[PDB]
Amino acid sequence: KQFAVIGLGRFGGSICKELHRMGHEVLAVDINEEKVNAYASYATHAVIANATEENELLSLGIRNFEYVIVAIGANIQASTLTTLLLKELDIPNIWVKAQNYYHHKVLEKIGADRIIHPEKDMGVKIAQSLSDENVLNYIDLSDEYSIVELLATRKLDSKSIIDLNVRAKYGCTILAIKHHGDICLSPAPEDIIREQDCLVIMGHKKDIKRFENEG
């Protein structure tokens, strides 16, 4: 797998550093000279080039990369013209960072394989923690079911799993407990619930909220 990242920003630079850490060949492309020099050591190859030019894009050997990431989310003209050239160049996978709803629709028309909203997806996840301080991190399996890593309160201290009727009343399944750095996968009845540690639970979205308010 050969990866090309166009645009070394906060989002683009994180992909280059993470993929290079895992041991992948990453091409870092940016129009700014200072950005390329900073990420020269964090990428296999770093080039100062303009992605809106077809002649400069063909000089990079961009046709040899299966995955090309266009991490430009503040210049719609630069982002949409870059993916038009890549779609014309028959790139199998083009992942684009969008800015707003209208930028999402333009990329969908010109053939974006995946469109990413980094700030919008984090803003929704952060606001869920702001509304309810009991949650720490959640993953939406569907629109009605999710896995929520809850935080143990004072009333749940010194309580066994069998004492909590999550399975019968709330219809939720306890998944894991992070006992002060110790992690137990699929706890068996019964385990004592300690102080403010991570409590992983699984259930319906409305059913978990009932457990937070009541249990």
Q: Which residues of the shown chain bind ligand ATP in the complex (CB under 6 A)?
A: 6-12, 29-32, 35, 50-52, 71-75, 78, 119
Dist CA 181 CA 57 (whole Å): 48
CB-based contacts of 67, cutoff 8 Å, min separation 6: 1, 2, 3, 4, 92, 93, 95
Query: CB 108 → ligand ATP: shortest distance, Å?
Result: 18
Report the 10 Å Cβ neighbour count for 15. 20
Q: What H or E segment, with its residue span, contains residue 108?
A: helix 101-109
Order the strands of the 198-204 sheet from edge to edge: 135-140, 145-151, 198-204, 173-179, 182-185
DSSP 3-state of 183: strand
Binding residues, by number, are 10, 30-32, 50-51, 72-74, 97-99, 103, 119
| Residue 144 in contact with a second copy, rule: CB under 8 A | yes
Q: Pick one of 47, 48, 60, 106: the residue that binds a second copy (CB under 8 A).
A: 106
Residue number with CB closer to ligand ATP (12 or 203): 12
**Mask 174-203, x = binds a second copy (CB under 8 A)?**
-xx-x----x-xx-----------x-x-xx
Dist CA 5 CA 70 (whole Å): 6
> Which parts of this chain interact with a second copy (CB under 8 A)?
1, 3, 9-15, 17-19, 22, 24, 67, 69, 73, 75-77, 80-81, 84-85, 88, 95, 99-100, 102, 105-106, 109-111, 116-124, 126-128, 130-131, 137-139, 141-142, 144-145, 147, 149, 173, 175-176, 178, 183, 185-186, 198, 200, 202-203
